[PDB]
With several copies, the nearest count.
Chain A
Amino acid sequence: VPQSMETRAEVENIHITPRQIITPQANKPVMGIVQDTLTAVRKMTKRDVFITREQVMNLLMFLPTWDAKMPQPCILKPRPLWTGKQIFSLIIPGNVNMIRTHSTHPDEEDEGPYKWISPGDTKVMVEHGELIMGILCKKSLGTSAGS
Chain B
Amino acid sequence: AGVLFEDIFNVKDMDPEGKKFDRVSRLHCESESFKMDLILDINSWLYPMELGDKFRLVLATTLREDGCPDSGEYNPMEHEGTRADSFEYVMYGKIYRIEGDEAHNEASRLSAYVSFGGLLMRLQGDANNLHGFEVDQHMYLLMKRLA
Q: Chain A residues in contact with chain B, CB under 8 A? A: 45-48, 50, 53, 69-86, 116-121, 125, 127-128, 131-133
Contact in complex: A50, B23 (CB < 8 Å)? yes
Give the shortest distance, in Å, between A50 (CB) and chain B (any CB).
Answer: 6
- Contacts of B4 on A, CB cut-off 8 Å? none
The verdict on B34 contacting chain A, using a C-beta distance below 8 Å, is no
Give the shortest distance, in Å, between B49 (CB) and chain A (any CB).
Answer: 15
- Contacts of B99 on A, CB cut-off 8 Å? 116
Secondary structure at the A interface, as helix, strand, loop or mixed, is loop
Q: Which residue of A lies closest to B143 (CB)?
A: A77
Q: Which residue of A lies closest to B72 (CB)?
A: A72
Contact in complex: B117, A133 (CB < 8 Å)? no
- Contacts of B17 on A, CB cut-off 8 Å? 119
Contact in complex: B96, A117 (CB < 8 Å)? no
Q: Chain B residues in contact with chain A, CB under 8 A? A: 17, 20-24, 26, 39, 41, 43, 46, 72-74, 76, 79, 84, 87-93, 96-97, 99, 113, 115-122, 136, 140
Nearest first, the 3 A-B pairs at minimum CB distance are A74-B117, A76-B90, A48-B23
Contact in complex: A77, B136 (CB < 8 Å)? no
Contact in complex: A82, B91 (CB < 8 Å)? no
**Known interface pairs A133-B96, A133-B115; 10 further A-B residue pairs with C-beta atoms within 8 A, sorted by A's residue number:** A50-B43, A71-B74, A72-B73, A73-B74, A74-B93, A76-B84, A76-B140, A83-B117, A84-B118, A119-B26
Q: Which of A48, A117, A118 sits near B22, CB closer than 8 Å?
A: A48
- Contacts of A76 on B, CB cut-off 8 Å? 79, 84, 90-92, 140
Q: Which of B41, B93, B121 sits near A47, CB closer than 8 Å?
A: B41
Contact in complex: A69, B73 (CB < 8 Å)? yes
A71-B73, A75-B43 known; A133-B118 Cβ under 8 A: yes
A70-B73, A83-B117, A116-B99 known; A75-B23 Cβ under 8 A: no
- Which of A45, A46, A76, A78 has the most chain B CB atoms inside 10 A of its CB? A76
> 5 A-B contacts, Cβ less than 8 Å apart?
A47-B119, A76-B140, A83-B117, A117-B120, A117-B122
- Contacts of A70 on B, CB cut-off 8 Å? 73-74
Q: Which residue of B lies closest to A79 (CB)?
A: B46
Contact in complex: A120, B118 (CB < 8 Å)? no
A46-B21, A48-B22 known; A77-B88 Cβ under 8 A: yes
